Amino acid sequence: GSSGSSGLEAPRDLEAKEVTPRTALLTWTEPPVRPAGYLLSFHTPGGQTQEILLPGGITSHQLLGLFPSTSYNARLQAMWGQSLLPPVSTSFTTGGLRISGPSSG
């Protein structure tokens, strides 16, 4: 039979949280079968791409080296026995370098 799920599952509920012009946190729901590893790749709309080898065993990753008001496209792909389940691509925009009162009292 054609390539299907075969019981295996993929990550879901992947949404951008705590989005800032300095960093961006991405949370996702890990499957019932912890994958061998995680391959997060975030590229810019018009620039280059950067791959990151995750430790394999988390729900959210803290990205660094972002741009102010720059859209990014992250992807969550887990390594499975001679298989690469379909990852999830999500778009998120960062805020703007604008600080009014950093020292809250």
Backbone as JSON Lines, residues from 0, in Angstrom:
{"i":0,"aa":"G","n":[0.81,-1.21,0.0],"ca":[0.0,0.0,0.0],"c":[0.84,1.26,0.0]}
{"i":1,"aa":"S","n":[0.37,2.29,-0.7],"ca":[1.09,3.55,-0.78],"c":[1.56,4.0,0.6]}
{"i":2,"aa":"S","n":[2.48,4.96,0.62],"ca":[3.02,5.48,1.87],"c":[1.94,6.21,2.67]}
{"i":3,"aa":"G","n":[1.65,5.7,3.86],"ca":[0.63,6.31,4.7],"c":[1.15,6.63,6.09]}
{"i":4,"aa":"S","n":[0.25,6.65,7.07],"ca":[0.62,6.95,8.45],"c":[1.25,5.73,9.12]}
{"i":5,"aa":"S","n":[0.58,4.59,9.0],"ca":[1.07,3.35,9.59],"c":[1.08,3.45,11.12]}
{"i":6,"aa":"G","n":[0.0,4.0,11.68],"ca":[-0.1,4.14,13.12],"c":[0.64,5.37,13.63]}
{"i":7,"aa":"L","n":[1.86,5.57,13.13],"ca":[2.67,6.71,13.54],"c":[1.85,8.0,13.52]}
{"i":8,"aa":"E","n":[2.32,9.01,14.25],"ca":[1.64,10.29,14.31],"c":[2.62,11.44,14.17]}
{"i":9,"aa":"A","n":[2.1,12.64,13.91],"ca":[2.93,13.82,13.75],"c":[2.54,14.91,14.75]}
{"i":10,"aa":"P","n":[3.39,15.94,14.86],"ca":[3.15,17.06,15.78],"c":[1.98,17.94,15.33]}
{"i":11,"aa":"R","n":[1.19,18.39,16.3],"ca":[0.03,19.23,16.01],"c":[-0.05,20.39,17.0]}
{"i":12,"aa":"D","n":[-0.98,21.32,16.74],"ca":[-1.16,22.47,17.61],"c":[0.1,23.33,17.64]}
{"i":13,"aa":"L","n":[0.68,23.57,16.47],"ca":[1.9,24.37,16.37],"c":[1.56,25.83,16.09]}
{"i":14,"aa":"E","n":[1.66,26.67,17.11],"ca":[1.36,28.09,16.97],"c":[2.48,28.94,17.57]}
{"i":15,"aa":"A","n":[2.69,30.12,17.0],"ca":[3.73,31.03,17.48],"c":[3.26,31.78,18.73]}
{"i":16,"aa":"K","n":[4.06,31.72,19.78],"ca":[3.73,32.39,21.03],"c":[4.88,33.29,21.49]}
{"i":17,"aa":"E","n":[4.59,34.19,22.42],"ca":[5.6,35.11,22.94],"c":[6.46,35.67,21.81]}
{"i":18,"aa":"V","n":[5.8,36.13,20.75],"ca":[6.5,36.7,19.6],"c":[7.04,38.09,19.92]}
{"i":19,"aa":"T","n":[8.34,38.27,19.72],"ca":[8.98,39.56,19.98],"c":[9.99,39.9,18.9]}
{"i":20,"aa":"P","n":[10.33,41.19,18.79],"ca":[11.3,41.68,17.8],"c":[12.72,41.23,18.11]}
{"i":21,"aa":"R","n":[12.88,40.5,19.21],"ca":[14.19,40.01,19.62],"c":[14.24,38.48,19.59]}
{"i":22,"aa":"T","n":[13.09,37.86,19.81],"ca":[12.99,36.4,19.81],"c":[11.56,35.94,19.57]}
{"i":23,"aa":"A","n":[11.38,34.64,19.41],"ca":[10.05,34.07,19.18],"c":[9.98,32.64,19.69]}
{"i":24,"aa":"L","n":[8.97,32.36,20.5],"ca":[8.78,31.02,21.06],"c":[7.71,30.26,20.28]}
{"i":25,"aa":"L","n":[8.01,29.01,19.93],"ca":[7.07,28.17,19.19],"c":[6.7,26.93,19.99]}
{"i":26,"aa":"T","n":[5.42,26.8,20.32],"ca":[4.94,25.66,21.08],"c":[4.18,24.68,20.19]}
{"i":27,"aa":"W","n":[4.33,23.39,20.48],"ca":[3.66,22.35,19.7],"c":[3.34,21.14,20.57]}
{"i":28,"aa":"T","n":[2.35,20.36,20.15],"ca":[1.94,19.18,20.89],"c":[2.67,17.93,20.38]}
{"i":29,"aa":"E","n":[3.54,17.38,21.22],"ca":[4.3,16.19,20.85],"c":[3.38,14.97,20.74]}
{"i":30,"aa":"P","n":[3.68,14.1,19.77],"ca":[2.89,12.88,19.54],"c":[3.07,11.86,20.66]}
{"i":31,"aa":"P","n":[2.24,10.8,20.63],"ca":[2.29,9.74,21.64],"c":[3.54,8.87,21.5]}
{"i":32,"aa":"V","n":[4.24,9.02,20.38],"ca":[5.45,8.26,20.14],"c":[6.64,9.18,19.9]}
{"i":33,"aa":"R","n":[7.33,9.54,20.98],"ca":[8.49,10.42,20.89],"c":[9.39,10.01,19.73]}
{"i":34,"aa":"P","n":[9.6,10.94,18.79],"ca":[10.45,10.71,17.61],"c":[11.92,10.59,17.97]}
{"i":35,"aa":"A","n":[12.68,9.92,17.12],"ca":[14.11,9.74,17.34],"c":[14.82,11.08,17.51]}
{"i":36,"aa":"G","n":[14.43,12.05,16.69],"ca":[15.03,13.37,16.76],"c":[14.14,14.45,16.18]}
{"i":37,"aa":"Y","n":[14.6,15.69,16.25],"ca":[13.83,16.82,15.73],"c":[14.7,17.71,14.84]}
{"i":38,"aa":"L","n":[14.16,18.11,13.7],"ca":[14.88,18.96,12.77],"c":[14.1,20.24,12.48]}
{"i":39,"aa":"L","n":[14.44,21.31,13.19],"ca":[13.77,22.59,13.0],"c":[14.54,23.48,12.03]}
{"i":40,"aa":"S","n":[13.87,23.92,10.98],"ca":[14.5,24.78,9.97],"c":[13.68,26.04,9.75]}
{"i":41,"aa":"F","n":[14.28,27.19,10.02],"ca":[13.61,28.47,9.85],"c":[14.33,29.33,8.81]}
{"i":42,"aa":"H","n":[13.61,29.72,7.77],"ca":[14.18,30.54,6.71],"c":[13.42,31.86,6.58]}
{"i":43,"aa":"T","n":[14.07,32.85,5.97],"ca":[13.46,34.16,5.79],"c":[12.9,34.31,4.38]}
{"i":44,"aa":"P","n":[11.81,35.08,4.25],"ca":[11.16,35.33,2.97],"c":[12.0,36.21,2.04]}
{"i":45,"aa":"G","n":[12.98,35.59,1.39],"ca":[13.84,36.33,0.48],"c":[15.31,36.18,0.83]}
{"i":46,"aa":"G","n":[15.58,35.59,1.99],"ca":[16.96,35.4,2.42],"c":[17.41,33.96,2.29]}
{"i":47,"aa":"Q","n":[18.16,33.49,3.28],"ca":[18.66,32.12,3.28],"c":[17.92,31.27,4.31]}
{"i":48,"aa":"T","n":[18.29,29.99,4.38],"ca":[17.67,29.07,5.32],"c":[18.67,28.57,6.35]}
{"i":49,"aa":"Q","n":[18.19,28.28,7.56],"ca":[19.05,27.79,8.63],"c":[18.42,26.58,9.31]}
{"i":50,"aa":"E","n":[19.18,25.49,9.39],"ca":[18.7,24.27,10.02],"c":[19.22,24.15,11.45]}
{"i":51,"aa":"I","n":[18.41,23.55,12.32],"ca":[18.78,23.38,13.72],"c":[18.45,21.98,14.21]}
{"i":52,"aa":"L","n":[19.45,21.28,14.73],"ca":[19.26,19.92,15.23],"c":[18.77,19.94,16.68]}
{"i":53,"aa":"L","n":[17.47,19.75,16.86],"ca":[16.88,19.74,18.19],"c":[17.34,18.53,18.99]}
{"i":54,"aa":"P","n":[17.27,18.63,20.32],"ca":[17.67,17.55,21.23],"c":[16.72,16.36,21.16]}
{"i":55,"aa":"G","n":[15.52,16.59,20.62],"ca":[14.54,15.52,20.52],"c":[13.94,15.15,21.86]}
{"i":56,"aa":"G","n":[12.96,15.93,22.3],"ca":[12.32,15.65,23.58],"c":[11.79,16.91,24.24]}
{"i":57,"aa":"I","n":[11.29,17.84,23.43],"ca":[10.75,19.09,23.94],"c":[9.42,19.43,23.27]}
{"i":58,"aa":"T","n":[8.78,20.49,23.75],"ca":[7.5,20.92,23.19],"c":[7.62,22.31,22.57]}
{"i":59,"aa":"S","n":[8.61,23.07,23.01],"ca":[8.83,24.42,22.5],"c":[10.32,24.73,22.42]}
{"i":60,"aa":"H","n":[10.71,25.52,21.42],"ca":[12.1,25.9,21.24],"c":[12.24,27.42,21.16]}
{"i":61,"aa":"Q","n":[13.31,27.94,21.77],"ca":[13.56,29.37,21.77],"c":[14.52,29.76,20.65]}
{"i":62,"aa":"L","n":[14.0,30.44,19.63],"ca":[14.81,30.86,18.5],"c":[15.53,32.17,18.81]}
{"i":63,"aa":"L","n":[16.73,32.33,18.25],"ca":[17.52,33.54,18.46],"c":[18.02,34.1,17.14]}
{"i":64,"aa":"G","n":[18.42,35.37,17.15],"ca":[18.92,36.0,15.95],"c":[17.82,36.27,14.94]}
{"i":65,"aa":"L","n":[16.8,37.0,15.36],"ca":[15.68,37.33,14.49],"c":[15.72,38.8,14.07]}
{"i":66,"aa":"F","n":[14.77,39.2,13.23],"ca":[14.71,40.58,12.75],"c":[13.39,41.23,13.16]}
{"i":67,"aa":"P","n":[13.43,42.55,13.4],"ca":[12.24,43.32,13.8],"c":[11.23,43.45,12.67]}
{"i":68,"aa":"S","n":[10.02,42.94,12.9],"ca":[8.96,43.0,11.9],"c":[9.32,42.16,10.68]}
{"i":69,"aa":"T","n":[9.95,41.02,10.92],"ca":[10.35,40.12,9.84],"c":[9.62,38.79,9.93]}
{"i":70,"aa":"S","n":[8.89,38.45,8.87],"ca":[8.14,37.2,8.83],"c":[9.08,36.0,8.7]}
{"i":71,"aa":"Y","n":[8.8,34.95,9.45],"ca":[9.61,33.74,9.42],"c":[8.75,32.5,9.24]}
{"i":72,"aa":"N","n":[9.34,31.46,8.67],"ca":[8.62,30.21,8.43],"c":[9.35,29.03,9.08]}
{"i":73,"aa":"A","n":[8.82,28.56,10.2],"ca":[9.42,27.44,10.92],"c":[8.8,26.12,10.48]}
{"i":74,"aa":"R","n":[9.51,25.02,10.73],"ca":[9.03,23.7,10.36],"c":[9.5,22.65,11.37]}
{"i":75,"aa":"L","n":[8.57,21.79,11.79],"ca":[8.89,20.74,12.75],"c":[8.86,19.37,12.08]}
{"i":76,"aa":"Q","n":[10.04,18.79,11.89],"ca":[10.16,17.48,11.27],"c":[10.93,16.51,12.17]}
{"i":77,"aa":"A","n":[10.29,15.41,12.52],"ca":[10.92,14.4,13.38],"c":[11.45,13.24,12.55]}
{"i":78,"aa":"M","n":[12.59,12.69,12.97],"ca":[13.21,11.57,12.27],"c":[12.64,10.24,12.77]}
{"i":79,"aa":"W","n":[12.05,9.48,11.85],"ca":[11.47,8.19,12.2],"c":[12.13,7.06,11.4]}
{"i":80,"aa":"G","n":[12.06,5.85,11.94],"ca":[12.66,4.71,11.26],"c":[12.5,4.78,9.76]}
{"i":81,"aa":"Q","n":[13.6,5.0,9.06],"ca":[13.58,5.09,7.6],"c":[12.31,5.79,7.12]}
{"i":82,"aa":"S","n":[11.96,6.89,7.78],"ca":[10.77,7.65,7.42],"c":[10.86,9.08,7.94]}
{"i":83,"aa":"L","n":[10.2,10.0,7.24],"ca":[10.21,11.41,7.63],"c":[8.79,11.98,7.63]}
{"i":84,"aa":"L","n":[8.01,11.62,8.65],"ca":[6.64,12.1,8.77],"c":[6.52,13.53,8.27]}
{"i":85,"aa":"P","n":[5.32,13.9,7.8],"ca":[5.04,15.24,7.28],"c":[5.04,16.29,8.39]}
{"i":86,"aa":"P","n":[6.01,17.21,8.34],"ca":[6.14,18.28,9.33],"c":[5.03,19.32,9.2]}
{"i":87,"aa":"V","n":[5.07,20.33,10.07],"ca":[4.07,21.39,10.05],"c":[4.72,22.76,9.88]}
{"i":88,"aa":"S","n":[4.34,23.46,8.82],"ca":[4.89,24.78,8.54],"c":[3.93,25.88,9.01]}
{"i":89,"aa":"T","n":[4.46,26.85,9.74],"ca":[3.66,27.95,10.25],"c":[4.37,29.28,10.06]}
{"i":90,"aa":"S","n":[3.6,30.33,9.76],"ca":[4.16,31.66,9.55],"c":[3.86,32.56,10.74]}
{"i":91,"aa":"F","n":[4.87,33.33,11.15],"ca":[4.72,34.24,12.28],"c":[5.56,35.5,12.08]}
{"i":92,"aa":"T","n":[4.99,36.65,12.45],"ca":[5.68,37.92,12.3],"c":[6.13,38.46,13.65]}
{"i":93,"aa":"T","n":[7.34,39.0,13.7],"ca":[7.89,39.55,14.93],"c":[7.41,40.98,15.16]}
{"i":94,"aa":"G","n":[7.52,41.45,16.4],"ca":[7.09,42.8,16.72],"c":[8.05,43.85,16.22]}
{"i":95,"aa":"G","n":[8.01,45.03,16.83],"ca":[8.89,46.11,16.42],"c":[9.7,46.67,17.58]}
{"i":96,"aa":"L","n":[10.97,46.97,17.32],"ca":[11.84,47.51,18.35],"c":[11.31,48.83,18.89]}
{"i":97,"aa":"R","n":[10.37,48.75,19.83],"ca":[9.78,49.94,20.42],"c":[9.56,49.75,21.92]}
{"i":98,"aa":"I","n":[10.41,50.4,22.72],"ca":[10.31,50.3,24.17],"c":[9.94,51.64,24.79]}
{"i":99,"aa":"S","n":[8.95,51.63,25.68],"ca":[8.49,52.84,26.34],"c":[8.92,52.86,27.8]}
{"i":100,"aa":"G","n":[8.55,51.82,28.54],"ca":[8.9,51.74,29.94],"c":[9.42,50.37,30.33]}
{"i":101,"aa":"P","n":[10.72,50.13,30.08],"ca":[11.36,48.85,30.4],"c":[11.5,48.63,31.9]}
{"i":102,"aa":"S","n":[11.83,49.69,32.62],"ca":[12.0,49.61,34.07],"c":[10.68,49.9,34.79]}
{"i":103,"aa":"S","n":[9.78,48.92,34.76],"ca":[8.48,49.07,35.4],"c":[8.64,49.29,36.9]}
{"i":104,"aa":"G","n":[8.68,50.55,37.31],"ca":[8.83,50.88,38.71],"c":[10.0,50.15,39.36]}
